[PDB]
């Protein structure tokens, strides 16, 4: 037993991290087969970032302008293209450590592991969720651009995030691995603000089920609620609406614990209305919303990866 914010084992991704240097800009790239993926603002300078035209900027580049370090081994670029906000550098060497992989654009509420990197070297790994407002509450310092977020599914790495930028509120914005930003953000230094965030209701419910699986039951009650009446209370506390689809996803957890989903909604309702009154759940004095129903099942049942 026990319940922890658990990241996926990061080794499959560690073997793909490289350093990309162009001009005065150094950041991380992702080396898969013979392509290195990295944020396109690596071709910017200290005065380009205000409103750059990356198409002009890139047409003025030569392959030899791109320094890619894979450890103590320099890779030479033999081609380059831009795809949305990512730059793709074709190198003459295929990464022998390339894992089985996919690129996936995730929905808000979904979680993933972030391998924070500086200068192509991994620094740490942690679990994130894509917030409803398409930011992530990460831990990123200058130099971390190009670090990626991912999930692992049996033997397959599903890359879903590459880091680009930090918003004035201390939260983070980035793209999928095809270079499309999550949310309304753009890779230019202009006024941008996250948008009001909300709590991921289906995830909170998943985590309450995790608590029950693990022996916290103090927050349960004998009441039930309708989805409609629950959502009326959720909206008041700035929770995302719970859909019948969410209810269906919570089926397995509801079945394993014997607590009907709408019964758990009644518990969340009372927790929202009364607070926790000095009690904790799974070591938290807040309602935790960065575990998906799948995360809970994986960790409470012990799924692995080869």
Ligand X SMILES: *[C@](O)(C(=O)NCC)[C@H](C[C@@H]1CCNC1=O)NC(=O)[C@@H]1[C@@H]2[C@H](CN1C(=O)[C@@H](NC(=O)NC(C)(C)C)C(C)(C)C)C2(C)C
Which residues are designated catalytic? Answer: 41, 145
Is residue 75 classed as helix, strand or coil in its secondary structure? strand
Which residues face 37 on adjacent strands?
30, 88
286 belongs to the binding site for a copy of itself (CB under 8 A) = yes
- C-alpha pair distances (Å), 250 with each of 3, 102, 192: 18, 26, 35
49 belongs to the binding site for ligand X (CB under 6 A) = yes
Q: Note the Cα 283 to chain centre separation in Å.
A: 23
CB of 129 to ligand X, least distance (A): 17
Interface segment toward a copy of itself; rule CB under 8 A; list 99-107, 116-124, 193-201, 219-227 = 116-124
Q: Which of 68, 86, 91, 117 binds a copy of itself (CB under 8 A)?
A: 117
Instruction: Kindly give the residue spans of alpha helices, DSSP state H, lying in 217-305.
Output: 227-236, 244-249, 251-257, 261-274, 293-301
- C-alpha pair distances (Å), 292 with each of 128, 150, 214: 11, 15, 16
CB of 42 to a copy of itself, least distance (A): 18
Judged by beta carbon, residue 80 or residue 172, the one nearer a copy of itself is: 172
Sites for a copy of itself among residues 54-83 (CB under 8 A):
71
Q: Which of 49, 82, 171, 220 binds a copy of itself (CB under 8 A)?
A: 171
167 belongs to the binding site for ligand X (CB under 6 A) = yes
Contact 207, 199 (CB under 8 A): no
- C-alpha pair distances (Å), 152 with each of 156, 163, 290, 306: 6, 18, 17, 10
Among a copy of itself, ligand X, none, partner that 284 touches (CB below 5 to 8 angstroms by kind): a copy of itself
For residue 197 the two structure tokens come to 């965030």
Sites for a copy of itself among residues 147-166 (CB under 8 A):
166
Which residues face 149 on adjacent strands?
114, 161
Judged by beta carbon, residue 139 or residue 238, the one nearer a copy of itself is: 139
CB of 152 to ligand X, least distance (A): 22
Binding site for a copy of itself (CB under 8 A): 1-12, 14-15, 71, 115-119, 121-126, 128, 137-144, 166, 170-172, 214-215, 280, 283-286, 298-306
């Amino acid at each position: 037993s026990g319940f922890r914010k658990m990241a996926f084992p990061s080794g499959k991704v560690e073997g793909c991290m490289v350093q990309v240097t162009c001009g005065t800009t150094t950041l991380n790239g992702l080396w898969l087969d013979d392509v290195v993926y990295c944020p396109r603002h690596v071709i910017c300078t200290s005065e380009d970032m205000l409103n750059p035209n990356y198409e002009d900027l890139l047409i003025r580049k030569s392959n030899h302008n791109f320094l890619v370090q894979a450890g103590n081994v320099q890779l030479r670029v033999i081609g380059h293209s831009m795809q949305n906000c990512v730059l793709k550098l074709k190198v003459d060497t295929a990464n022998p450590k390339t894992p089985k992989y996919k690129f996936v654009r995730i929905q808000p509420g979904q979680t993933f592991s972030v391998l924070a990197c500086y200068n192509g070297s991994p620094s740490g790994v942690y679990q994130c969720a894509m917030r409803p407002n398409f930011t992530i509450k990460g831990s990123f310092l200058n130099g971390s651009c190009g670090s990626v977020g991912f999930n692992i599914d049996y033997d397959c790495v599903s890359f879903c995030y590459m880091h680009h930028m930090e918003l004035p509120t201390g939260v983070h914005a980035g793209t999928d691995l095809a270079g499309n930003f999550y949310g309304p953000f753009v890779d230019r230094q202009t006024a941008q603000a996250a948008g009001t965030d909300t709590t991921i209701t289906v995830n909170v419910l998943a985590w309450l089920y995790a608590a029950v699986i693990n022996g916290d039951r103090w927050f349960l009650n004998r009441f039930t609620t309708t989805l409609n009446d629950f959502n009326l209370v959720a909206m008041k506390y700035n929770y995302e609406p719970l859909t019948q689809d969410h209810v269906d996803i919570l089926g397995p957890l509801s079945a394993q614990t014997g607590i009907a989903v709408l019964d758990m909604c009644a518990s969340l309702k009372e927790l929202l209305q009364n607070g926790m009154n000095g009690r904790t759940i799974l070591g938290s004095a807040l309602l935790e919303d960065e575990f998906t129903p799948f995360d809970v099942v994986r960790q409470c049942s012990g799924v692995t990866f080869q």
